[PDB]
Amino acid sequence: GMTDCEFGYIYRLAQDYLQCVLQIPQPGSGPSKTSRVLQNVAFSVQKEVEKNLKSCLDNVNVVSVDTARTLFNQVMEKEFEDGIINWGRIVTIFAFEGILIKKLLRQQIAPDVDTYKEISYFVAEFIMNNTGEWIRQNGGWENGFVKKFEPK
Amino acid sequence: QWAREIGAQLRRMADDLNAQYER
């Protein structure tokens, strides 16, 4: 709905997607309708990004949450610097946090079970601060994203 | 250099993806 552009909702989407990538079970009936649609398309994109940018991503060592955060912000700053926002770009934010959590799982010097909660937090910060107004104006997750990305 | 290259390439892939849903 109208308020699904606020932090708590976005943070839950970002956390849900990292739990999907890490194959962590979140108990209950399941993720929301938004998350269910987002996880499929974000994962498809993630696999294509991993393949297309494999040589680039081989030079990427994500050894700490602080490196993950600066790298994420550097990548997102450049991706969005032309001022354009669309749902495809928003999907790539989720795909990229999935890449970061996989690199951390292998490379993090001092891993902690709550790491995915810290990554998804700064991801939600970026989405809210840089795309939240556009999300709201375009129908939010329920009337915008899901309507365009759910099955016909 | 790598982060900046990744960002530009994510933009390219995102806009191609987006065109399949924004007609």
Numbering used by the authors:
A (entry chain A): 0 to 151
B (entry chain B): 1 to 23
From the paper:
Anti-apoptotic members of the Bcl-2 family are broadly recognized as promising cancer therapeutic targets. Human anti-apoptotic proteins Bcl-2, Bcl-xL, Bcl-w, Mcl-1 and Bfl-1 have a globular, helical fold and function by binding to short, α-helical Bcl-2 homology 3 (BH3) motifs in pro-apoptotic proteins, as shown in Figure 1A. Competition for binding among BH3-containing proteins regulates mitochondrial outer membrane permeabilization (MOMP), which is an irreversible step toward caspase activation and cell death. The role of anti-apoptotic protein Bfl-1 in cancer is less characterized than that of Mcl-1 or Bcl-xL, but many lines of evidence suggest that Bfl-1 is also a critical target. Thus, Bfl-1 is an intriguing therapeutic target and biomarker for resistance to cytotoxic anticancer drugs.
BIM and PUMA bind with low-nanomolar affinity to Bfl-1, but also to anti-apoptotic paralogs Bcl-2, Bcl-xL, Mcl-1 and Bcl-w. Here, we addressed this by successfully re-engineering PUMA, a promiscuous binder of anti-apoptotic proteins, to make it highly selective for Bfl-1 both as a non-covalent and as a covalent inhibitor. Crystal structures of Bfl-1 bound to PUMA vs. FS2 show that epistasis arises from a substantial alteration of the Bfl-1-binding mode. FS2 binds in a shifted and rotated orientation relative to PUMA, and does not make a key salt bridge that is conserved in nearly all structures of Bcl-2 protein complexes. Crystals of Bfl-1 in complex with PUMA, FS2 or FS2_1fX peptides were grown in hanging drops over a reservoir containing 1.8 M ammonium sulfate, 0.1 M MES pH 7.0 at room temperature. The PUMA and FS2_1fX complex data sets extended to 1.33 Å and 1.73 Å, respectively, and were phased with the Bfl-1 chain of the FS2 complex model.
